[PDB]
Amino acid sequence: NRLKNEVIAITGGGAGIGLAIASAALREGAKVALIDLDQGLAERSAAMLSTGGAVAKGFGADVTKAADITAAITSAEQTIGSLTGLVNNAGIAGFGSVHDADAAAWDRIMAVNVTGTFLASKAALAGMLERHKGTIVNFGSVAGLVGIPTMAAYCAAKGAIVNLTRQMAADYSGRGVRVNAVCPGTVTSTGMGQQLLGSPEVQARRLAKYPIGRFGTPEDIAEAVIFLLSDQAAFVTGAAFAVDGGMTAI
Amino acid sequence: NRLKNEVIAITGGGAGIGLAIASAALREGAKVALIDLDQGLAERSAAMLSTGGAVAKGFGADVTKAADITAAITSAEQTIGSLTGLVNNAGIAGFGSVHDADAAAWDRIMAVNVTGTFLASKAALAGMLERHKGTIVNFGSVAGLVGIPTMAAYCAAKGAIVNLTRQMAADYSGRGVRVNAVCPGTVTSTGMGQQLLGPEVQARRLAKYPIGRFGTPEDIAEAVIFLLSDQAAFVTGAAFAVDGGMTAI
Amino acid sequence: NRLKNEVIAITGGGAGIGLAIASAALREGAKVALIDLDQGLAERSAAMLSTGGAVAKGFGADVTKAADITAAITSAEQTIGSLTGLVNNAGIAGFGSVHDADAAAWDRIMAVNVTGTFLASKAALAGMLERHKGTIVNFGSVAGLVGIPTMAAYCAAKGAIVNLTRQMAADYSGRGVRVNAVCPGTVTSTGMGQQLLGSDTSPEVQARRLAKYPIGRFGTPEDIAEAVIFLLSDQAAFVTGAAFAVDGGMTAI
Amino acid sequence: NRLKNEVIAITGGGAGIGLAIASAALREGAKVALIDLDQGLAERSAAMLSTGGAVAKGFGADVTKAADITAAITSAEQTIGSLTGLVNNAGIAGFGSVHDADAAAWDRIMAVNVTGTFLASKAALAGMLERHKGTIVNFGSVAGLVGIPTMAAYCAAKGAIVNLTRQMAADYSGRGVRVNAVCPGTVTSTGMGQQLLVQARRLAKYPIGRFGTPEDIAEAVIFLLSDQAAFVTGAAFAVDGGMTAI
Ligand SMILES: NC(=O)C1=CN([C@@H]2O[C@H](COP(=O)(O)OP(=O)(O)OC[C@H]3O[C@@H](n4cnc5c(N)ncnc54)[C@H](O)[C@@H]3O)[C@@H](O)[C@H]2O)C=CC1
Numbered sequence: 001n002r003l004k005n006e007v008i009a010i011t012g013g014g015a016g017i018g019l020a021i022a023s024a025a026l027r028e029g030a031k032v033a034l035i036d037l038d039q040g041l042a043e044r045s046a047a048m049l050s051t052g053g054a055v056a057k058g059f060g061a062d063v064t065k066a067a068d069i070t071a072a073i074t075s076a077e078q079t080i081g082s083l084t085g086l087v088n089n090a091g092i093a094g095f096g097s098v099h100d101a102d103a104a105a106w107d108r109i110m111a112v113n114v115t116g117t118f119l120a121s122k123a124a125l126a127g128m129l130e131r132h133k134g135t136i137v138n139f140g141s142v143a144g145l146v147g148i149p150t151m152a153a154y155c156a157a158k159g160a161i162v163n164l165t166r167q168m169a170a171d172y173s174g175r176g177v178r179v180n181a182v183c184p185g186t187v188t189s190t191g192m193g194q195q196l197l198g199s200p201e202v203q204a205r206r207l208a209k210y211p212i213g214r215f216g217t218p219e220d221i222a223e224a225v226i227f228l229l230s231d232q233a234a235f236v237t238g239a240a241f242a243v244d245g246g247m248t249a250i
Numbered sequence: 251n252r253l254k255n256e257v258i259a260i261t262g263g264g265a266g267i268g269l270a271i272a273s274a275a276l277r278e279g280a281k282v283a284l285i286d287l288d289q290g291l292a293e294r295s296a297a298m299l300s301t302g303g304a305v306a307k308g309f310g311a312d313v314t315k316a317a318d319i320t321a322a323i324t325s326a327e328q329t330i331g332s333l334t335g336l337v338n339n340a341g342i343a344g345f346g347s348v349h350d351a352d353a354a355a356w357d358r359i360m361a362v363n364v365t366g367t368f369l370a371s372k373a374a375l376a377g378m379l380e381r382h383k384g385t386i387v388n389f390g391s392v393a394g395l396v397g398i399p400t401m402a403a404y405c406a407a408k409g410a411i412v413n414l415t416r417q418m419a420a421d422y423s424g425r426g427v428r429v430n431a432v433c434p435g436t437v438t439s440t441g442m443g444q445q446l447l448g449p450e451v452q453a454r455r456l457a458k459y460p461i462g463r464f465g466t467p468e469d470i471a472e473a474v475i476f477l478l479s480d481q482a483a484f485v486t487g488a489a490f491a492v493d494g495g496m497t498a499i
Numbered sequence: 500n501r502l503k504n505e506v507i508a509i510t511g512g513g514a515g516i517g518l519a520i521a522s523a524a525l526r527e528g529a530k531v532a533l534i535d536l537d538q539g540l541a542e543r544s545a546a547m548l549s550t551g552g553a554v555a556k557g558f559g560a561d562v563t564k565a566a567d568i569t570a571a572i573t574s575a576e577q578t579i580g581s582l583t584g585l586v587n588n589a590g591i592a593g594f595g596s597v598h599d600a601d602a603a604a605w606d607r608i609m610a611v612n613v614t615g616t617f618l619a620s621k622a623a624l625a626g627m628l629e630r631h632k633g634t635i636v637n638f639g640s641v642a643g644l645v646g647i648p649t650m651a652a653y654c655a656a657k658g659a660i661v662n663l664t665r666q667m668a669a670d671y672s673g674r675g676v677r678v679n680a681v682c683p684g685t686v687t688s689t690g691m692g693q694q695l696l697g698s699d700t701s702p703e704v705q706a707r708r709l710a711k712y713p714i715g716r717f718g719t720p721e722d723i724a725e726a727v728i729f730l731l732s733d734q735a736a737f738v739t740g741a742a743f744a745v746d747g748g749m750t751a752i
Numbered sequence: 753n754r755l756k757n758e759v760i761a762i763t764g765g766g767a768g769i770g771l772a773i774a775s776a777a778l779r780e781g782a783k784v785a786l787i788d789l790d791q792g793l794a795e796r797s798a799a800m801l802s803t804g805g806a807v808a809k810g811f812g813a814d815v816t817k818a819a820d821i822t823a824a825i826t827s828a829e830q831t832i833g834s835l836t837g838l839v840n841n842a843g844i845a846g847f848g849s850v851h852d853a854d855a856a857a858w859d860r861i862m863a864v865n866v867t868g869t870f871l872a873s874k875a876a877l878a879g880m881l882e883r884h885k886g887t888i889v890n891f892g893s894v895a896g897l898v899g900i901p902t903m904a905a906y907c908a909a910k911g912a913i914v915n916l917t918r919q920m921a922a923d924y925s926g927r928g929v930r931v932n933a934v935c936p937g938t939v940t941s942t943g944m945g946q947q948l949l950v951q952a953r954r955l956a957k958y959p960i961g962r963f964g965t966p967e968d969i970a971e972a973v974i975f976l977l978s979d980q981a982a983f984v985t986g987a988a989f990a991v992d993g994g995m996t997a998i
C-alpha cells in the first residue's frame with residue numbers, strides 16, 4: 001500500500017513501460033488513469049488491469065495537443081479523483097544525425113517528448129499547486145545524459161527533459177510538488193525497444209555498455225517510478241535517477 | 251517484502267541516519283547488523299530495535315581498522331546469516347579550507363569516509379562475490395557533488411565516494427553485486443547535523459533547498475531501503491540525490 | 500595567430516557575445532562571417548570589425564529557417580572561403596514556468612536555440628564532413644546544467660543543446676569534426692543580460708543573483724569569447740563533446 | 753605572450769604531461785618552476801627547456817610531505833618570483849579493485865593525488881591570497897568522472913580531486929584565486945600511460961579515434977592558467993577525445 005489514496009495519470013500508459021508503471025501502481029493501491037494517443041489501447045489495457053478491485057481507466061489524448069491533453073487530465077480527475085501524481089512517460093524515438101536528419105521527424109520527436117511533458121504538466125499543475133500536493137515523474141533516458149550515435153533529435157529531446165525537470169523542481173518543490181526524472185537504460189521488450197534493435201557483434205557492442213550484463217525490463221523501470229511517486233520519496237526532488245544497469249557510470 | 255530474506259550490515263548503524271536505515275530495513279523484513287565505532291551504542295540500539303520478532307544485532311568496529319571491520323562482519327554473519335547487503339554509512343565531517351586545514355584531521359576525515367568504505371566493502375565482497383549476490387550502498391552527500399565553503403577534506407572524501415561507487419559498479423555489477431551511492435542533503439537532527447549547525451547563516455543554508463526544509467534521517471533511509479531491495483535490480487552505479495532539490499539548482 | 504587560416508561563421512554574430520567572439524577571432528587571424536536575424540546589424544558590425552586588414556562580412560538569416568541559414572553559409576563560403584568553424588551563438592530567452600508559460604513563446608525559444616543549432620550545423624556539416632575538418636561550438640548556459648526559476652522553455656532548450664553537443668561529438672569526432680558547448684554564467688551587458696535584469700527590479704533579488712557566483716561578479720562578453728576562441732583553435736584538438744562551464748563558479752556550488 | 757608576467761609552479765614537472773605544460777607555459781612567456789619527486793630530473797628537464805631566454809628552474813619535493821613541498825615552493829619563489837599559478841600535476845596510478853587492493857598501495861595513490869594536491873595548494877595559497885591573485889589547476893582524469901575497471905584507488909583519488917576543485921573554487925574565487933581541474937583522457941606516451949598499457953577495446957571508448965598527447969593536455973592547462981580564463985573557476989574541463997560524452 002505504498003500508493004494508498006494516490007491518483008496517478010500516466011501518459012503513454014497503454015503499452016510498454018507506461019503499462020508496467022500502471023500495473024505496479026495498482027499493486028501499491030493507487031487509482032490510475034492511462035492516457036494514450038491510442039484511445040482503444042488505453043481502454044483495453046485499463047480493463048485488463050482492473051482486477052481484484054483495482055481501479056484503472058483509459059483516456060485518449062495526444063500529449064502535443066494542449067486542448068486534448070488538458071481535457072484528458074480533467075476527465076481523469078472527474079473519473080477517479082484529483083491527481084496526486086503525473087508520469088510523463090509518452091515519448092517517441094527516431095534516428096538521424098544532425099547532417100541528414102529528417103527535420104519534420106525532428107520536430108515530432110521534440111514535440112512528443114518535450115512539448116508533451118510541458119503541456120501535460122501544465123494541465124496537472126493547476127490542481128496540484130492549488131492543493132499544495134503533487135509528484136511529477138518525467139522520462140529522461142541514458143540518451144538524455146550522454147550522446148548516442150545517430151540519434152540527434154532524441155538526445156536533444158531527452159536532454160531537454162532532464163534539465164526541464166531540474167527547472168520544474170526549482171519552481172515547485174517549495175510549493176508542495178516534487179519533480180524528478182527517471183533515466184532508463186535500454187529496455188528491449190517494448191515497441192520502442194524493438195524499434196531500436198530493428199549481428200552477434202553489433203548488439204553485443206551495445207550490451208557491453210551495460211556493466212550489469214543485461215538490458216532493462218519494463219518492470220525494472222516501473223519500480224523506480226513507483227518509488228519516486230510515493231511519499232517515501234518526500235525529500236527527493238530535482239533528481240535525474242539513472243536506472244540503467246551502470247551504463248552512465250562507466 | 252520488501253527486504254524479506256535480506257541480511258544487511260550497516261556501518262555507523264548505532265545512531266543518526268544509520269539507525270533510521272536499520273529501523274526501516276527491519277520494517278521491510280530484513281535482519282540487520284549495526285556496526286559502530288561505539289560498541290555499547292550498537293548493542294543498545296540493536297536491543298531497542300529487536301521487538302516484535304525483529305532481529306537486530308550490534309557489533310563494535312572502527313571501519314578504518316581492517317582486522318576489526320572484518321571481524322565484525324564475520325561475527326554478524328555467524329549471528330544473522332550471510333550478508334546480502336552492506337550500507338557504508340559510517341562517516342565523519344569537519345571544517346577547514348585548503349589553506350588552513352589541519353593535515354591530521356584531513357587524514358581522519360578521508361580515512362573514515364573513504365578508507366572505511368574501501369575496507370568494509372573489501373570484507374563484505376569476499377562472501378558476496380562467492381555467492382554472486384549483493385548490494386552495497388555508499389554514502390556520498392551533496393558535499394560530494396558540489397563544493398561546500400570551509401569543508402575541504404569532507405568534499406574531497408565525499409567526492410571520492412561518489413566516483414569510487416561508479417568504479418565499484420564497473421567491477422562488480424556483472425558479478426551479481428550492485429553498488430550505488432545515496433547523496434543526502436543536510437539532515438539537521440543527527441549528531442553530525444548538530445555539529446554542522448554549531449541564524450542569518452541558517453536561513454542562507456535553508457535557501458539552498460528548493461523544497462524549503464532540511465532532510466530527516468527517515469527521508470534518507472527510504473532511499474537506501476529502495477536501493478537495497480530487489481525492486482532496484484537494474485539500479486547500479488547511481489549517485490542518487492536525496493537532497494530536496496539542492497543539486498538541481 | 501591562434502586562428503590563422505580559419506574561417507569561422509558565427510550565428511547571432513551582430514551583437515553581444517557573438518560580436519565579442521568575432522572580435523577575438525579576428526584578433527587571432529581568422530576570417531569571420533557574422534550571420535544574424537538582423538541583416539543590417541550583421542553588416543554594420545562586420546564593417547566596424549574590418550579594420551587593420553581584418554576580414555569580417557555580414558549576412559542575414561533566421562537560424563530557424565533551413566533555406567535561409569543554408570543560403571547564408573553558402574554566401575559566406577563564396578565570400579571568405581570554406582568554413583573551418585561554426586559558432587551556434589544565436590539564442591533567445593524568455594520567462595514562464597510550466598504552469599503558465601505561453602505555448603507559442605515556448606516553441607519560439609525551443610526553435611531559435613535547439614532547431615537553430617540543428618539547422619545551422621546541418622548546413623555547415625556538409626562541407627566540414629567532406630573536408631574531414633571542422634569545429635562546432637554550441638551555446639549552452641548555466642541554465643542548461645541547472646534549473647533556473649521561471650525559465651522553463653529556456654532551461655529545456657539549453658538542456659537540449661548540452662546533450663545534443665554530446666550526441667554530435669559521438670557522431671562526428673572520428674570524422675574530423677569536434678563539437679563542444681560553452682555554458683556561460685550570466686553576462687549582464689548584452690541585450691539578453693538586460694532582458695534578464697529588467698525582469699525583476701528588487702535589489703534583494705539582484706544581490707541574491709550575484710551571490711550565486713563565487714567569483715563575485717557576472718561575466719563579460721569578452722570572458723565568454725576567450726573560451727570559444729580556445730575551443731575553435733587547433734590547440735583544442737583533443738577537446739570534443741565537452742560542456743565547458745564559463746560561469747564564475749556558479750555550477751560548482 | 754599569453755602568460756607574460758606569470759610565474760607557474762608545476763608539480764611532477766620533470767616528465768610527461770607536467771613537462772609538456774612547462775614547455776607550453778614558457779612558449780607563452782611564463783617563468784616556470786618544475787617540482788618533482790626526482791630532483792635530478794626536475795633540474796635536467798629545466799635545463800633542457802631553458803633556451804632562447806626562457807626561465808625554467810628545477811626543485812625536488814615529495815608533494816605528500818608538507819615541509820618538503822612548502823620548502824620547494826618557497827625556494828621557487830625566491831629564485832623566480834612570487835607564484836601566480838600552481839599546477840597540481842603530480843599523481844600516480846595503480847591497479848586493484850576494492851575486493852583485492854592492498855591497503856598500503858591504496859594509501860599511497862590517495863596520498864600523492866589527493867594529499868599532494870592539498871599540501872601543495874596549502875603552500876601556494878598563503879602568497880596567492882595575500883596578493884589576491886592566483887590560478888590553480890588540479891589534475892582529475894576521465895577516471896575521476898566515471899568508473900574504470902580494476903582502478904579503485906585511482907578512481908577514488910581523481911574523484912576526490914574533481915570535487916575538491918569545486919570546494920576550493922567555492923572558498924577562493926571571490927578572493928582572487930581561480931581553481932579548476934583538467935580531466936584528461938588516456939595519454940599513452942608518458943610513464944603512466946606506458947605503465948597502464950583489449951587495447952582496441954580501450955580506443956573504441958574514444959570518439960575522436962585516438963588517445964591524447966601530453967601537448968593536447970598542456971594546451972588546456974595553459975588556457976586555464978591565463979588571464980583570458982578570468983571567468984573560469986570551479987570547472988572540471990574534460991580534455992578526453994569525447995570519452996565522457998558517450
Ligand atoms: N524502451 C527503451 O529502451 C527506453 C525508453 N525510454 C522512454 O520511456 C518512455 C516509454 O518508452 P516505451 O515504453 O519503450 O515506449 P513505447 O513505444 O513501447 O510506447 C509508448 C506509448 O506512448 C504512446 N504515445 C506515443 N506518442 C504519443 C503521444 N503524442 N501522445 C500520447 N501518447 C503517445 C504510444 O501510443 C505508446 O502506447 C518514453 O519516454 C521513452 O522515450 C527511455 C529510455 C529507455
Ligand SMILES: NC(=O)C1=CN([C@@H]2O[C@H](COP(=O)(O)OP(=O)(O)OC[C@H]3O[C@@H](n4cnc5c(N)ncnc54)[C@H](O)[C@@H]3O)[C@@H](O)[C@H]2O)C=CC1
Nearest residue numbers: 262266267287312313340341389391434436437440441442
Ligand atoms: N547529517 C547530514 O547532514 C548528512 C550526513 N551525511 C553522511 O551520512 C552518513 C551518516 O551521517 P549521520 O547519521 O548524520 O552521522 P552521525 O554523526 O549522526 O552518526 C554516525 C555514526 O557513525 C559512527 N562512526 C563514526 N566513525 C566511525 C568509524 N570510524 N567506524 C565505525 N563507525 C563510526 C558514529 O559512532 C555514529 O554513531 C555519513 O556518511 C555522513 O557523512 C551525508 C549527507 C548529509
Ligand SMILES: NC(=O)C1=CN([C@@H]2O[C@H](COP(=O)(O)OP(=O)(O)OC[C@H]3O[C@@H](n4cnc5c(N)ncnc54)[C@H](O)[C@@H]3O)[C@@H](O)[C@H]2O)C=CC1
Nearest residue numbers: 511515516536561562589590638640683685686689690691
Ligand atoms: N547574456 C547571458 O547572460 C547569457 C547568454 N547565453 C547564450 O549566449 C548566446 C548569446 O547571448 P547574448 O549575446 O546575451 O544574446 P543577445 O540577445 O545580446 O544577441 C543575440 C543575437 O542573436 C540574434 N538572433 C536572435 N534570434 C535569431 C535567429 N532566429 N537567427 C539568427 N540570429 C538571431 C539577435 O539578433 C542578436 O543579435 C545565446 O545562445 C544565449 O542564450 C548563455 C548564458 C549566459
Ligand SMILES: NC(=O)C1=CN([C@@H]2O[C@H](COP(=O)(O)OP(=O)(O)OC[C@H]3O[C@@H](n4cnc5c(N)ncnc54)[C@H](O)[C@@H]3O)[C@@H](O)[C@H]2O)C=CC1
Nearest residue numbers: 764768769789814815841843891893936938939942943944
Ligand atoms: N597518462 C595518462 O593517461 C593520464 C594521466 N593523468 C594525470 O595526469 C598527471 C600526470 O600524468 P603523467 O604525465 O602521465 O605522469 P608521469 O608518470 O609520466 O610523471 C609524473 C611525474 O610526477 C612525479 N611524481 C610522482 N610522485 C610524486 C610525488 N609524490 N611528488 C612529486 N612528484 C611526483 C614523477 O616523478 C613524474 O616525473 C597525473 O596527475 C595523472 O594522474 C590523468 C589522465 C590521463
Ligand SMILES: C[C@H](O)CSCCS(=O)(=O)O
Nearest residue numbers: 093141143148186206209
Ligand atoms: C531509446 C532508449 O532511450 C535507448 S537509446 C540507446 C541507449 S544504448 O543502447 O546506446 O545504451
Ligand SMILES: C[C@H](O)CSCCS(=O)(=O)O
Nearest residue numbers: 343391393398436455458
Ligand atoms: C554534512 C552533510 O554532508 C552536509 S554538507 C553541507 C551541505 S549544505 O548545508 O551547504 O547544503
Ligand SMILES: C[C@H](O)CSCCS(=O)(=O)O
Nearest residue numbers: 592640642647685708711
Ligand atoms: C540567460 C542566461 O543563460 C542566464 S540564465 C540565469 C542564470 S542566473 O543569473 O540565475 O545565475
Ligand SMILES: C[C@H](O)CSCCS(=O)(=O)O
Nearest residue numbers: 845893895900938954957
Ligand atoms: C590514468 C589515466 O587517468 C587514464 S585511466 C583509464 C582511462 S580509459 O583508457 O579506460 O579510457
